[PDB]
Amino acid sequence: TDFYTIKDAQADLAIAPLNLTVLLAPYSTTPATTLESPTDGSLAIPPGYKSVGHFEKQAGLTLGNEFDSKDIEAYGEPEPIRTIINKRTTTFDFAMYQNQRNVLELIWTQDFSNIQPSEFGGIVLEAPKVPKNIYYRAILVGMDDRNDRPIWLYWLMPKVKLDKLDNQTLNDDNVIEYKPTLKAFRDDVVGYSVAQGFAGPGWRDLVATAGFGEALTALTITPGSPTVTVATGASHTAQLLVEGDNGINYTPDVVFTSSAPDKASVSAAGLVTGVAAGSATITATKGALTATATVTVTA
Amino acid sequence: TDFYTIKDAQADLAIAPLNLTVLLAPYSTTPATTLESPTDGSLAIPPGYKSVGHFEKQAGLTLGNEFDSKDIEAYGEPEPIRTIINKRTTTFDFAMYQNQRNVLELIWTQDFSNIQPSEFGGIVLEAPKVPKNIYYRAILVGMDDRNDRPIWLYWLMPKVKLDKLDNQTLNDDNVIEYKPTLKAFRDDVVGYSVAQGFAGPGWRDLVATAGFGEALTALTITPGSPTVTVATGASHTAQLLVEGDNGINYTPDVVFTSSAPDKASVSAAGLVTGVAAGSATITATKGALTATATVTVTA
Amino acid sequence: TDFYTIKDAQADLAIAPLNLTVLLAPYSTTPATTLESPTDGSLAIPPGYKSVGHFEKQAGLTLGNEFDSKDIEAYGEPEPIRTIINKRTTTFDFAMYQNQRNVLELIWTQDFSNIQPSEFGGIVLEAPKVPKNIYYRAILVGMDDRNDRPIWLYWLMPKVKLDKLDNQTLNDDNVIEYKPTLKAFRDDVVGYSVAQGFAGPGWRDLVATAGFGEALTALTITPGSPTVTVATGASHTAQLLVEGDNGINYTPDVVFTSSAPDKASVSAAGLVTGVAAGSATITATKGALTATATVTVTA
Amino acid sequence: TDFYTIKDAQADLAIAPLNLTVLLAPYSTTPATTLESPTDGSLAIPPGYKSVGHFEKQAGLTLGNEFDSKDIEAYGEPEPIRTIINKRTTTFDFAMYQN
16 A cells, blocks of 8 residues: 555645635524525525625634643643643634624624614714623634535634724725624533534535545435326426435436436426326436436326 | 552542532421432432522632540550540531522521512611521532533531631622631431532442442343333333442443344333334343343234 | 533622722711612612712722620530520721711711811811710612613611721822721611612512512503593503512513504503593513503593 | 815924934033024024034934823722823933044
């Protein structure tokens, strides 16, 4: 065995967040559990999460993790017999550009929902008497677009608080930047402080390679031998679902073909409509893996 | 024999009270004899023991022990011929944060059960003209969570009394702390002043190593070969019970398998349900030890 | 039952005296029974109590409690058979900045009410040839401001006397501080030496959880179904009253709505004003609980 | 009213010390009160002040001001109730050439 086989390097698993956005929601909003829609796996932001818009490219977004642990030392032991990690402090910071309501609320620790614009649109936002402890739910979601198969990777922080505010420098040749450092706290209802997740059509290809689940070996068409009506109606169409050995829906990834197009009409998605009564064979093929089903059309 | 073998140090026997809570009950309550539930060994607190809530981390909780002894000295004997130890005084102190009824009753040596809030919820707690002699029942129970197998170690004090009250300091940036020093007395009906106890799955793992009882050398299935009915009914399900030689129930620790899943269905809890008639072998494996039972299912 | 449920820790019951003030009144003043105004529950200080002003933050205010007890010991009993607690001495000390009349009177144990300033406003305060035994009535009231719902917690001492005076240091970079230690005695008329009390909307929120009285389970509209006249007059307006099962007035906490605004107009205070004749339904909602009343307006 | 009228910027009021000199005098000399001659407003150095001559251009002449103050904090007040500024120390440094 040579060195390269042992190394087993997969350049595809390296994910570059080509686009990124941060969505903040008030603490009353139900925290998000996953960003994948149950319908078709598309990106689905839960209601109440509103983005903070553009932020500075050069600084980007910085995530920091810090451990605070106490080690128990016994006599004669060079290394501790037991170490106690109290917490894992997670923070993240960025540099927003936009002077919208939520950004100013975040930086001023105040609720400006009651602020009403004056007769000419002018507003005045007063800093509170003492800073308030306001908690938000944060979704940091980024898209890596490769071969038109995006990978959406996101950080879910169900409870964050404004921990630090950097210095604000005003220049005549630059826009105003707000640079807060937000600390993520533990949330009891969901049981985690920060969660990292992946989703998207691009990630579905790399699920097996990354080591989550089992490698795809066989393809199976879940609807077996369906009967479709020639006449128009609610039961005139039947939707096919293709699955794998590891339990992942591979329908968007497979290619649908019909042996007899007139008897049954199949699309790329997998819908089956029986134009003419008879027997047809619908085959879903992805790579070298093939699944076949038979459709009977009765008028 | 090298030095390490002689030392025979077990780093798993070091228990750190990662979480700690103090529960106080009125003297009329029946004192707790153990915090282990006889049903399944889980942490069960007798009714009437109400917790005091949060308390200061930095101060922590301090246990103190003192001995009062008199030495009988004889002529020509450099050391005493007999030592009469009159009493072992046990005390403990901590700094509570919460301003609830039991805490204020404890610090004020008064019963506030008759205090009713005013029309708008306000209350006034008048200190008694003379401090009262009030006794409580105390439980100091702490959880050490290691690899999701908690160890609950507790101190039971069937008769405690407020002995001292530290100076209280009001600061504009610090919460109000009540710091009582409670002295444990002897309770005649139960027979002790303080009792230290251990419980939990982690202690069940470490009970044999710690030197209490004998080590676990073999397993035994007490139900042996039971009978189970296919038809639904009260006797349709039979619960197994794995026991150790040292008399400790090791059912949660062992792993249950069934030779023929159709004949007899067994779960992690060990319950046998006869889906189909036939003879099956139930195997409970823990570590390198194995127990076997035969279950026959009759239709 | 897991450990957290047994602990049952309420972080909202921790009260931090964000602001604090000490009010001293001459012994002839009627002692304060409570700081809660019976009219609306707001903070109401009885007349004659004049505040001492600012005092040092770093030193803060220190409250100390001491017990004077004697133990009766019998033959063969390691612990005392009876403890006779003679008294509970309470003291409190702080460091005032302001050179008011009352502060200097307190530190000098003299009555300066007859001191008249000279032609240009100068005064001279001669210490008495022998210190006097002067008693005051003291209120130590602090406010914790959380989400604009203050909690006022106070200590009432109906009879205090200057017990100690710390060393006074003069520095060119420090104001002059008077640091007295006042001991609270027993007032025969009210029957106590120190009384701790709580009030405010925040306490009304937390009074049920703290264990005083019973919890709020249902609401009630005590006025029931009132009548209001369209014509202007004394009886034209009728004030509603929302009450809880535990006997606490929850009118500020509930939200008032009117089914038909024209028939009956109700504000946040709950006052029903009959603009137009007709039947309207007034709904008071608090959390998940709701109370309903019917108001009929006759022209 | 537009922004530039409100700003009211006067470029002439910006003074650049094109030439500089430092004159030291012994403590017995009567201190100067003003450098304007009463006769015609010309620059008039009082007697006893002798210049130190050339000094380094790149280093320039650095003036520094430092306040030392103590703030009195009361209970419940986030901001001090009184600030006692003890002193405003002034220093200046330069790199002389002449021996």
